[PDB]
Design a protein around this ligand. Structure first.
Ligand SMILES: COc1cc(F)c(CC(=O)N2CCN(c3nc(Nc4cc(C)n[nH]4)c4cccn4n3)CC2)c(F)c1
Length: 293
């Protein structure tokens, strides 16, 4: 079984990312011990808990079930014992997250290139939606760069499977949520759907066009519009109010009108009036072709 990875043969090379409930490492899986093994990505939990383990087992199954060019490849699992600790083994994408890649190569990345990535996220997302999976955490930090011409959705920590009788999923936290990417209904009602993923995709489109400018980030922009003198529970309250009164993220500098319109349509307060991923890709591909030859 290739899907079974022996723990003693997984050489730690570097920590890549940390989460509230886990981490991602760069390892070399070297069974022959001759230093010819491939470098892989290893996601692991930080809290031993049964409720976080169950969520993680569900996440492993969601990823195992995904086969697309714009989705990070599942490679296998790593067990240690009977009740174990469990590790998810994925392919290593060398250019890091889309957030870090863009932040460093802003001079090299055209608008056409940004739109090629956008279309790839849309295609990956539409594929998710056919399996009735809700991502719930669409952001540039969660998109990986395989190469200069290809991005993949690279983390599924918050992904949920829709119940068979509903088109939304209601879910809590319990700690810190990525609020500045959340749809109003996710803020008020805790409702997650394909439509709230579209809302968040809008924020991703925003991120990409700001070229990750710290002063222009979604938390920074929203906090200015709210008042940086705001508490904690009040931050969600005021954010709900601003969104409700058609308060939105500004058009990023240099961003064309056609693209900001895509963003604003993704940001419709009316769940049902938001575009579909298929149409999103269609408009994006159309714009890419108008900008090119
Ligand atoms: C609970 O664990 C998580 C999961 C997350 F998605 C994030 C989100 C986030 O911020 N990053 C930034 C750093 N990063 C990264 N990854 C690379 N390669 C890779 C990752 C995979 C699966 N395959 N290949 C790579 C190559 C070069 C530099 N990097 N940097 C990982 C994701 C976390 F922070 C924590």
């Amino acid at each position: 079984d290739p899907t079974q990875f022996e723990e003693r043969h997984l050489k730690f090379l570097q920590q890549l990312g940390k989460g509230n409930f886990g981490s991602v490492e760069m390892c070399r899986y070297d069974p022959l011990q001759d230093n010819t093994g491939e470098v892989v990505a290893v996601k692991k939990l930080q809290h031993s808990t049964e409720e976080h383990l169950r969520d993680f087992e569900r996440e492993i199954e969601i990823l195992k079930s995904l086969q697309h060019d714009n989705i990070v490849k599942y490679k296998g699992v790593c067990y240690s014992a009977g009740r174990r600790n469990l590790k998810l083994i994925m392919e290593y994408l060398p250019y890091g997250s889309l957030r870090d890649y863009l932040q460093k190569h802003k001079e090299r990345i055209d608008h056409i290139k940004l739109l090629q990535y956008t279309s790839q996220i849309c295609k990956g997302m539409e594929y998710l939606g056919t399996k009735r999976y809700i991502h719930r955490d669409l952001a540039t930090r969660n998109i990986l760069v395989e190469n200069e011409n290809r991005v993949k959705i690279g983390d599924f920590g918050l992904t949920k499977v829709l119940p068979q009788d509903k088109e939304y999923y209601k879910v809590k936290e319990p700690g810190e949520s990525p609020i500045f990417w959340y749809a109003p209904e996710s803020l008020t009602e805790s409702k997650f759907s394909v439509a709230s993923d579209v809302w968040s995709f809008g924020v991703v489109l925003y991120e990409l066009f700001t070229y990750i400018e710290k002063s222009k980030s979604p938390p920074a922009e929203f906090m200015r519009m709210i008042g940086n003198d705001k508490q904690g529970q009040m931050i969600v309250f005021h954010l709900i109010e601003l969104l409700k009164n058609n308060g939105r993220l500004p058009r990023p500098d240099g961003c064309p009108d056609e693209i900001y319109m895509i963003m604003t349509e993704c940001w419709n307060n009316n769940v049902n009036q938001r575009p579909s991923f298929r149409d999103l890709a269609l408009r994006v591909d159309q714009i890419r072709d108008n900008m090119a030859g």
